């Protein structure tokens, strides 16, 4: 079974993408990085990416992670710090969920992966 199926699949990623953004967008150290994003198609993306990235999808139909945030980390200050955050704000709302530890720990080892981080720092 995949990680996408273990954690209960559509409704369970489109749950957690919803409550993540959520969480994200009242916490201070990353909120405003959102202030001109459209949050509809945000969530949308979120969905596609992370049943992709949990093995429910060969492939993610939409930008790659380096081009999608790269104005961020050239205009914006993005940075280390604002990476842990956003794992960690992903990780509290899984644990929130009632996600068995095991499972986030797969997630973590996914968001916090070099070939995820070193893309999207653009370092
Ligand atoms: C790492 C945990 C991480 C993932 C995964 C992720 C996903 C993601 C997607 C799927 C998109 C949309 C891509 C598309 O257009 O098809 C996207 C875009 C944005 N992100 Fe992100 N993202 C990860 C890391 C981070 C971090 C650390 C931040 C900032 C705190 C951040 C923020 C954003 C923003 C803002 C966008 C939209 C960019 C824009 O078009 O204005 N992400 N991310």
Same mark, same amino acid.
């Given at each position: 079974?995949?990680?996408?199926?273990?954690?209960? !699949?559509?409704?369970?990623?489109?749950?957690?993408?919803?409550?993540?953004?959520?969480?994200?967008?009242?916490?201070?150290?990353?909120?405003?990085?959102?202030?001109?994003?459209?949050?509809?198609?945000?969530?949308?993306?979120?969905?596609?990416?992370?049943?992709?990235?949990?093995? !429910?999808?060969?492939?993610?139909?939409?930008?790659?992670?380096?081009?999608?945030?790269?104005?961020?980390?050239?205009?914006? !200050?993005?940075?280390?710090?604002?990476?842990?955050?956003?794992?960690?704000?992903?990780?509290?709302?899984?644990?929130?969920?009632?996600?068995?530890?095991?499972?986030?720990?797969?997630?973590?080892?996914?968001?916090?992966?070099?070939?995820?981080?070193?893309?999207?720092?653009?370092?």
């Amino acid at each position: 079974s995949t990680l996408y199926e273990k954690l209960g !699949g559509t409704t369970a990623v489109d749950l957690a993408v919803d409550k993540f953004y959520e969480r994200v967008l009242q916490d201070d150290r990353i909120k405003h990085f959102f202030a001109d994003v459209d949050m509809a198609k945000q969530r949308a993306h979120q969905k596609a990416f992370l049943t992709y990235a949990f093995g !429910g999808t060969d492939k993610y139909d939409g930008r790659y992670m380096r081009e999608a945030h790269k104005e961020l980390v050239e205009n914006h !200050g993005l940075n280390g710090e604002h990476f842990d955050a956003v794992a960690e704000d992903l990780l509290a709302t899984l644990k929130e969920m009632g996600v068995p530890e095991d499972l986030i720990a797969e997630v973590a080892a996914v968001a916090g992966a070099p070939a995820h981080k070193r893309d999207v720092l653009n370092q």
